[PDB]
Design a protein around this ligand. Structure first.
Ligand code: CDL
Ligand code: CDL
Ligand code: PC1
Ligand code: PC1
Ligand code: PC1
Ligand code: PC1
Ligand code: UQ8
Ligand code: UQ8
Ligand code: HEM
Ligand code: HEM
Lengths: 460, 327, 55, 426, 58, 32
């Protein structure tokens, strides 16, 4: 009105304005003429439905009205070849760049002005896009997410991704990050093929990440049967089903057509010893543990929790001053796994670090005490339930469980953790120890270390 | 102040006049392909209405003074219309957008041959003026028909739109030049643009566009509404195609030969659902082979490769031959 | 529920955004919370969430 | 000043010397050398005007006598005055030929912006200096020019509060006005040299003797290979001008335009208003004023001509949107059933015939406008020359309207041919 | 969601900056009025409010 | 498409014609 325009032209308060009264009220008292209803939480209900083409949609009803989370999961680094290695990294570095329907600028502005968040991540066997926003913005954000996930990569996106991948490789090498070491560990474990393919992609192939290679990779990997769609905070499953239908229903079914498929993984217990003139030596010792389908995954998670929370700190870091940092690594895949230790300490006396790490790892195989097991289980429950409490992480692990097993197993992790017993963990670790060790060493005096046969004998 | 909710917008952009702003799903700026827009506009202007009637009568003059003129000049220069239409000399000489797109997407030869073709003529014309390209070069210039130049032009324009022009968001801007001249200093870009005021948001629905009926109609028969099934339609279509071929010498066939209508009808029948065995099996096989080859993107054989260089330091930069027991 | 569709855009009556006073429907609901004071002056506040897995 | 990003070239003596000693020029013809002729005429104008300044006393009542007496007692003074006048004439000729040549090649592209505008500004300044120079003659022609300029200046202020006094004191040529205008003339004439240097540095970014993109990569070294050709072309054009002037202007002539310069301010009070005529280069503007008897509309026409001449790259350029700009069309919207139209792309120079026809119509209209004086004594009582009105209106339309430049007809016809050929050959 | 076109943002920002700069127009006008006041008086009492047409008897 | 831009285009096209009309009227008046 005239009064508002006048009081805005001269920067003076309008006392009689209702908005001013609302925005300058006493924080210790409720607002004068507004009051929100009280609501109580409701149980969570999961529903999974497959479309005609093969796309499967998971949904969870709203426990308490909050922001709507949405996600697209793809079974598509394990599926990359040497020609197209690092394509997932380029997509991640340019996950907002789409051209068919919306522009990079517009799809960034949608996230910015929606108040929500949009993110992408990728593992050896998974690629997950997730966007959380308000209900009224749900349709636009879902359209953006679908376009980003399923639209073929463009030449401009390919160039930007190549530049960003070069920057990422330079940064990773400069910082000597633990991921750069895990890449060598995986290469040793499985070789240059399959799981051993680095997550960041081969450095020599970065220049080859053109739109053609990315599109070929997507065509040979992204198929309707390998796509999952998830939502959380949805009042009605049918509404989200219709929303997904309006977008992903076009993709013609790939059933009955030649699929790329995944070749079975092979485990090799090689060794790597890098001289780098480093004041500190980092070692890693891993073994083929178990896949997701096995019943010991909970046992290995409990063992890792026991190592990290209780044993590694007390027996390795606290007692010895030359242990910079020790941590247990545990990865599980659809057909393989890797459980072990990674310890970094002083370059000199690396033999002592290696021997102590081997002894600590073998201690679990020797046995586990009741109090230690209870402490590890309590810590694992705390971590898992803290993850599950947040809606986004709960939805992500729901999608992963559905894509691994048709049922949802994250609603009863406590029961499985409780079922674990010290004998089971000890037997699992002892059986894993017999496998071919995967031993990686970097540092100044890696050369003066026991031979592979000596390490095997020590583990034996 | 907000441009929307301004007094003019409040009084005019109201549901009463159907001038209200409508908010829909977000969409990219530059939503309409220029090539498709020009195709539809050309069809509407030439093959419909009083404008179409007028422009049809002007086909002789336009063909003489706008097509055969350019073709004659290009042939004099040993060039074709492609050399002047696929990539304009402006883009070829100095254009940073074209340079970047070509570097990021194009193989060097695609523009190197374009530049060398003009270098052929201008190494002589500048040395001695009035150069008329000899017959042997003119022959290779004349070999390529316009039917392939149009394919190249459409491919390039569609690629540029789908990859670059579809990923651009223009903004309000001041003078690009950092010139102290006051006239250049206070140049204002963003107002007086129809696109700037047509939509104030990236969510607004588009209010002006071609109807699906017009888009489908523009993809019919350019020469006119005929019925190739009936003999009466085929006669008129052949007459129009013959006069077109006469007007445009190097458009679809050499200027001394005649167009093969049976092959065209076979292509139309194969492309659409209509089918029959009224054509010889040899004709069908040849047409299918030609169609496959025309749509086949060339690929490298990886054969007949030259030798790569592995240079080494000369002898004088290397230690002498002798090498005795050090101690 | 405001209407059948949760993802409706009807309330966005200001060029794709809510007007000045309005708020999203999701924020119109508040979890129960009881605050009490003891003799010692210690103030106890509870905001239960039954569906949550932790306390 | 964060908005100003920087300068294309730092005009330092070291860098200027290096740039001009390493400059390369592609093979060219005489048509693409009018800029060098303009610059050389500017240099000679600077020298000759400096020589003249030491003779001209800025008092109005002494300038005629001083000029007459110092031509005899001093040798080469009248030679320098003649050189100055003919240099002004040739400078106008070369500048307008350069403008026509650059309009012909469609240099309104974005990459030409810095090259184009920097030039036009120079041209604009080159106008002002000329005006000031006229005032220094202290003849009736100078009186009329000063009066017209003062009235135009006072037009913006609605004839209120003598805002013109700081330059056009009393709107008459006196000691103060002559001194101020002479000093301003000298300073701006010397500033023109720097403006021309800046324009020459800017324009080399994308320099082309012809629109067609020759594939040649080798280029001439400027210092002597190109400079010698530039000097020789200047010599040839000067010979042609000498021949044309010798034959077109008989030694004694009747009814010349210099006859209005007989009257000297102060000596002669009465002015023969029947025969009022400026030099041919300012003839078109006086003709426009006579043709358009409305003062405000005439001033607006002059300002519009100059400023639209300045802003050619913006109206007719690509505009950085890569030809995806949408025009406003009056009637073509009904024919195409579209509110706007995408800018046409294929607007070559040598090939297309519409561009040449329109450009030569514009050039001939300009020549006809400069061809004669409308003779306003009864130019309106007698229905005026329709050719003059047609030429002026075509000049206004050609500069500013994009339907006479980058026409849509060529693009539509080419697309129609493309569609027909592709359909026939699939 | 609110996704204004950057054209509009630039236009609004420039409108606000023009509003800010117009405030100093009256300042410079007052400075030039205090200065050159005799010129303002001559302008106001020469064209506006023209002098009366009359001459003294002497 | 905007009304004011279309009006500006119409003014640009039609103003020279208005000037010509004014000039013709001025000539007719000068005839007397
Ligand atoms: C010949 C005899 C007389 C000589 C007089 C010399 C000057 C005397 C006063 C100043 C003395 C100190 C000089 C210090 C210079 C420091 C900078 C420097 O050297 O940088 C290199 C500079 C270029 O800088 P740049 O960063 O490259 O920017 C240009 C780019 O190329 C970008 O190009 P673009 O295309 O984008 O721009 C085109 C063009 C477009 O330009 C325009 O359209 C604007 C019009 C031109 C500028 C007008 C200035 C008006 C000044 C009035 C002064 C009144 C008298 C009182 C003076 C005392 C102080 C008040 O731009 C320019 O030309 C801008 C450059 C300006 C050059 C003049 C700089 C000095 C004056 C600055 C103000 C006073 C500073 C005083 C400091 C000391 C304290 C007293 O080159 C020159 O200085 C060129 C010199 C040419 C000399 C020839 C004669 C011209 C004299 C000046 C212009 C007079 C016009 C008529 C005025 C009439 C008034 C009624
Ligand atoms: C109180 C008293 C105060 C003192 C008063 C006295 C003042 C004395 C000043 C002395 C200046 C020394 C300048 C040194 C360089 C001169 C050139 C050179 O290297 O000579 C070797 C050269 C060796 O012969 P050559 O093997 O055939 O080579 C010929 C080429 O010139 C060979 O050239 P090139 O092809 O190898 O390459 C030329 C150029 C590549 O081309 C270019 O890049 C040309 C330059 C581009 C930028 C400038 C454009 C405009 C051109 C220059 C201006 C020309 C007009 C000057 C008008 C002045 C006013 C009237 O490359 C360069 O050389 C780059 C540097 C160019 C010179 C600038 C830098 C050094 C000198 C200045 C340093 C300090 C900064 C300046 C300000 C200092 C203020 C204190 O000597 C001659 O040929 C000299 C011939 C002289 C006789 C013919 C002309 C006579 C005049 C006839 C008219 C009627 C008057 C008769 C005479 C009356 C008595 C005087
Ligand atoms: C210090 C370093 C050097 C610096 C160099 C600076 C260079 C500057 C370059 C710019 C100079 C600017 C002035 C250029 C002047 C150009 C000439 C000019 O204006 O005209 C001069 C004059 C005319 O000047 P005017 O003053 O009379 O002009 C009349 C006035 N106006 C033009 C305003 C109407 O022309 C001549 O008369 C010269 C030619 C004389 C005759 C010779 C040619 C005859 C051709 C026909 C011959 C046919 C014979 C056939 C039969 C033979 C039988 C044997
Ligand atoms: C195209 C040309 C390019 C090259 C040239 C570049 C020019 C660049 C622009 C320069 C503009 C300079 C304007 C100076 C005006 C001075 C005279 C004047 O103000 O009016 C005199 C006149 C003086 O009148 P007067 O009546 O006293 O005149 C004396 C008359 N006799 C001798 C008979 C007594 O002023 C007026 O009459 C108007 C009064 C206005 C009062 C209100 C103020 C208005 C704003 C004034 C701004 C002044 C700014 C000065 C500084 C400018 C710095 C850039
Ligand atoms: C708002 C509007 C402001 C004005 C802006 C308008 C644009 C202005 C652009 C100016 C461009 C100027 C370019 C000038 C380039 C040329 C310079 C030049 O040559 O010097 C000027 C010259 C020299 O002028 P001059 O004044 O020295 O001498 C000419 C003398 N009068 C004027 C009496 C003719 O000017 C001209 O006269 C040029 C045109 C002459 C054309 C004559 C051709 C022959 C005609 C024959 C008639 C038919 C006979 C046979 C009939 C029977 C057979 C068909
Ligand atoms: C001395 C008197 C001089 C009067 C001059 C009048 C000139 C009239 C013709 C030109 C006007 C300006 C054209 C550009 C307008 C901005 C761009 C545009 O098209 O906007 C359309 C836009 C939107 O147009 P739209 O509504 O068609 O766009 C929406 C379309 N749909 C709904 C289909 C998506 O409208 C505006 O908001 C602009 C309103 C007009 C603003 C004009 C300001 C400048 C002119 C007035 C200056 C002040 C004069 C004071 C006189 C005082 C006299 C005492
Ligand atoms: C496309 O590529 C191209 C270019 O790339 C940019 C070009 O540069 C160009 C040309 C552009 C240029 C800027 C260079 C122009 C070309 C040439 C040959 C130069 C022309 C000028 C001259 C020959 C004269 C040179 C003069 C000077 C360097 C001095 C400048 C003036 C100074 C220092 C002050 C003058 C002072 C005065 C008082 C004036 C009077 C002077 C006198 C000597 C006379 C009186 C003397 C006294 C002492 C009283 C072309 C054509 C081109 O094709
Ligand atoms: C709005 O109002 C305004 C104006 O008017 C409208 C203006 O004009 C202006 C600008 C104008 C001015 C301030 C006036 C300036 C005027 C100018 C530049 C005109 C002059 C231009 C020229 C090129 C003059 C050139 C002169 C010459 C070559 C003369 C050469 C003479 C000599 C003596 C040279 C030799 C000597 C030397 C170099 C001195 C060195 C020392 C010696 C020789 C020592 C000798 C002694 C001993 C003992 C040895 C402004 C700012 C303005 O506001
Ligand atoms: C490009 C540079 C210049 C141009 C375009 C120019 C233009 C002119 C013109 C058109 C005239 C009137 C000629 C006539 O009416 O016939 C003139 C006269 C004059 N100019 Fe310039 N001028 C320039 C440079 C200079 C310079 C640098 C000076 C002094 C340093 C100067 C000093 C004079 C003088 C003194 C007169 C009058 C001479 C007399 O009346 O006898 N000029 N100028
Ligand atoms: C006194 C005025 C002028 C001078 C001293 C001058 C000087 C020059 C010179 C020396 C050149 C290089 C030689 C050539 O291209 O022929 C040039 C080129 C050029 N001039 Fe000017 N010029 C002037 C006026 C103008 C005008 C009026 C315009 C346009 C309205 C203009 C625009 C250009 C352009 C665009 C080029 C580059 C042409 C190209 O890229 O092919 N100049 N100028």
């Amino acid at each position: 009105s005239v009064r508002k325009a006048f009081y805005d032209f001269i920067y003076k308060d309008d006392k009689s304005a209702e908005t001013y009264k609302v925005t300058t009220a006493d924080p210790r008292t409720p607002v004068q003429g507004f009051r929100g209803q009280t609501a109580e939480d409701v149980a969570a209900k999961y529903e999974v439905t497959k479309l005609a083409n093969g796309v499967t949609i998971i949904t969870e009803s709203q426990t308490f009205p909050s922001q709507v989370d949405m996600g697209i999961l793809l079974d598509v680094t394990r599926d990359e070849t040497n020609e197209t290695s690092g394509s997932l990294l380029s997509i991640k570095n340019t996950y907002l760049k789409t051209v068919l329907n919306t522009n990079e600028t517009i799809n960034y502005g949608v996230v910015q002005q929606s108040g929500g968040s949009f993110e992408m991540e990728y593992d050896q066997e998974t690629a997950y896009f997730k966007a959380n926003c308000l209900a009224h913005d749900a349709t636009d954000v879902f359209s953006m997410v679908a376009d980003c996930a399923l639209e073929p990569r463009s030449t401009v996106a390919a160039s930007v991704g190549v530049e960003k991948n070069q920057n990422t490789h330079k940064l990773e090498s400069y910082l000597k990050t633990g991921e750069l070491f895990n890449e060598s560990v995986f290469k040793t474990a499985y070789g240059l093929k399959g799981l051993g393919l680095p997550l960041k992609g081969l450095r020599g192939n970065v220049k080859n990440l053109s739109s053609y290679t990315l599109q070929k990779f997507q065509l040979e990997n992204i198929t309707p049967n390998r796509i999952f769609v998830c939502a959380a905070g949805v009042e009605s499953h049918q509404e989200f089903v219709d929303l997904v239908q309006t977008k992903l229903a076009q993709i013609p079914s790939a059933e009955g057509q030649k699929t790329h498929q995944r070749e079975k993984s092979e485990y090799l217990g090689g060794e790597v010893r890098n001289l780098t003139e480093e004041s500190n030596v980092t070692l890693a010792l891993l073994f083929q543990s178990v896949p997701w389908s096995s019943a010991d995954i909970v046992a290995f998670n409990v063992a890792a929790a026991l190592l990290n929370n209780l044993r590694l700190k007390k027996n390795l870091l606290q007692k010895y001053a030359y242990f910079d940092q020790a941590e247990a690594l545990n990865f599980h895949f659809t057909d393989s796994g890797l459980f072990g230790l990674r310890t970094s300490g002083s370059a000199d006396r690396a033999k002592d670090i290696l021997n102590h790490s081997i002894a600590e790892l073998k201690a679990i195989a020797s046995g586990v005490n009741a109090d230690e097991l209870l402490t590890a289980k309590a810590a694992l429950k705390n971590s898992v339930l803290s993850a599950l409490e947040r809606q986004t992480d709960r939805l992500e692990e729901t999608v992963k469980n559905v894509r691994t097993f048709n049922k949802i197993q994250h609603t009863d992790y406590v029961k499985q953790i409780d079922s674990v017993t010290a004998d089971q963990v000890a037997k699992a670790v002892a059986k894993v120890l017999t496998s071919n060790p995967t031993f990686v060493a970097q540092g100044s005096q890696v050369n003066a270390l026991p031979t592979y046969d000596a390490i095997r004998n020590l583990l034996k | 102040v907000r441009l929307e909710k301004i007094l003019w917008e409040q009084l005019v952009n109201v549901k009463a006049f159907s001038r209200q702003r409508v908010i829909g799903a977000p969409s990219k700026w530059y939503n309409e392909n220029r090539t498709e827009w020009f195709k539809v506009a050309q069809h509407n202007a030439f093959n419909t209405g009083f404008s179409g009637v007028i422009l049809r009568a002007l086909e002789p003059l336009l063909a003489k003074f706008i097509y055969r003129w350019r073709l004659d000049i290009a042939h004099q220069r040993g060039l074709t219309l492609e050399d002047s239409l696929l990539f304009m000399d402006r883009e070829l000489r100095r254009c940073y957008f074209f340079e970047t797109v070509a570097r990021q997407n194009l193989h060097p030869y695609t523009v190197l041959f374009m530049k060398k073709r003009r270098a052929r003529y201008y190494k002589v014309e500048r040395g001695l003026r009035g150069f008329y390209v000899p017959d042997w070069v003119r022959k290779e210039a004349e070999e390529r028909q316009l039917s392939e130049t149009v394919d190249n032009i459409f491919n390039w324009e569609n690629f540029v739109y789908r990859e670059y022009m579809s990923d651009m968001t223009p903004i309000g801007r001041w003078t690009s030049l950092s010139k102290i001249t006051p006239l250049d200093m206070f140049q204002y870009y963003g107002l007086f643009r129809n696109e700037a005021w047509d939509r104030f948001f990236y969510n607004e629905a588009f209010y002006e566009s071609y109807s699906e009926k017009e888009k489908q109609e523009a993809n019919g028969n350019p020469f006119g509404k005929f019925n190739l099934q009936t003999a009466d339609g085929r006669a008129q279509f052949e007459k129009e195609v013959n006069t077109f071929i006469e007007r445009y010498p190097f458009a679809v066939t050499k200027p001394g030969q005649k167009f093969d209508f049976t092959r065209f009808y076979a292509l139309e029948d194969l492309a659409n659902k209509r089918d029959t065995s009224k054509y010889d099996p040899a004709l069908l096989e040849s047409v299918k082979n030609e169609l496959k080859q025309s749509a086949a993107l060339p690929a490298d054989n990886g054969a007949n490769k030259t030798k790569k260089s592995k240079p080494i330091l000369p002898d004088w930069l290397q230690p002498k031959f002798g090498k005795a027991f050090q101690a | 529920k405001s209407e059948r569709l949760q993802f409706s855009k009807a309330r966005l009556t200001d060029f794709g955004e809510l007007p000045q006073g309005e708020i999203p429907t999701a924020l119109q609901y508040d979890r129960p919370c009881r605050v009490e004071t003891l003799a010692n002056g210690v103030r106890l506040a509870v905001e239960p969430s039954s569906v949550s897995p932790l306390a | 000043m964060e908005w100003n990003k920087g300068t294309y070239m730092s005009t330092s003596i070291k860098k200027i010397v290096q740039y001009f000693s390493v400059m390369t020029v592609s093979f060219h013809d005489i048509n693409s050398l009018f800029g060098f002729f303009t610059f050389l005429t500017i240099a000679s104008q600077l020298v000759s005007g400096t020589m003249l300044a030491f003779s001209l006393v800025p008092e109005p009542m002494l300038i005629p006598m001083v000029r007459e007496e110092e031509d005899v007692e001093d040798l080469y003074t009248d030679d320098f005055f003649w050189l100055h006048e003919r240099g002004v004439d040739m400078l106008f000729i070369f500048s307008y030929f350069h403008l026509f040549r650059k309009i012909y090649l469609n240099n309104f592209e974005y990459e030409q912006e810095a090259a184009w505008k920097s030039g036009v500004f120079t041209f604009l300044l080159f106008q002002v200096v000329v005006f000031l120079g006229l005032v220094l003659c202290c003849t009736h022609l100078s009186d009329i020019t000063l009066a017209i300029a003062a009235n135009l200046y006072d037009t913006f202020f609605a004839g209120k509060g003598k805002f013109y006094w700081w330059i056009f004191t009393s709107k008459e040529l006196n000691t103060d006005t002559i001194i101020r205008l002479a000093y301003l003339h000298y300073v701006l004439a010397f500033f023109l040299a720097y403006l021309g240097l800046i324009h020459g540095v800017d324009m080399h970014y994308d320099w082309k003797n012809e629109s067609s993109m020759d594939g040649l990569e080798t280029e001439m070294i400027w210092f002597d290979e190109a400079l010698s050709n530039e000097l020789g072309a200047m010599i040839e054009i000067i010979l042609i001008v000498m021949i044309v002037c010798f034959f077109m202007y008989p030694e004694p002539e009747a009814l010349s335009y210099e006859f209005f310069m007989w009257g000297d301010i102060g000596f002669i009070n009465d002015v023969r208003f029947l025969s009022v005529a400026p030099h041919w280069y300012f003839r078109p503007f006086m003709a426009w004023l006579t043709v358009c008897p409305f003062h405000k509309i005439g001033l607006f026409g002059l300002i519009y001509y100059f400023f639209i001449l300045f802003y050619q790259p913006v109206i007719h350029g690509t505009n950085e949107q890569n030809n995806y700009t949408k025009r406003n069309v009056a009637f073509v919207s009904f024919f195409i059933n579209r509110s706007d139209i995408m800018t046409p792309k294929y607007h070559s120079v040598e090939d297309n015939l519409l561009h040449q026809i329109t450009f030569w119509l514009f050039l001939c209209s300009a020549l006809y406008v400069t061809s004669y004086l409308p003779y306003g004594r009864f130019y309106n009582r007698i229905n005026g020359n329709y050719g003059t009105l047609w030429s002026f209106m075509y000049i206004f339309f050609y500069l500013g309207n994009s339907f006479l430049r980058r026409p849509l007809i060529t693009e539509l016809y080419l697309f129609n041919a493309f569609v027909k050929s592709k359909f026939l050959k699939k | 969601m609110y996704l204004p076109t950057f054209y509009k943002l630039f236009h609004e920002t420039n409108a606000f900056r023009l509003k800010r700069y117009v405030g100093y127009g009256p300042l410079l006008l007052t400075w030039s009025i205090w200065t050159l006041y005799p010129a303002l008086y001559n302008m106001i009492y020469s064209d506006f409010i023209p002098p009366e047409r009359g001459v003294p008897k002497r | 498409a905007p009304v004011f831009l279309k009006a500006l285009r119409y003014v640009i096209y039609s103003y020279p014609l208005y000037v010509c009309y004014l000039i013709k009227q001025a000539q007719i008046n000068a005839q007397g």
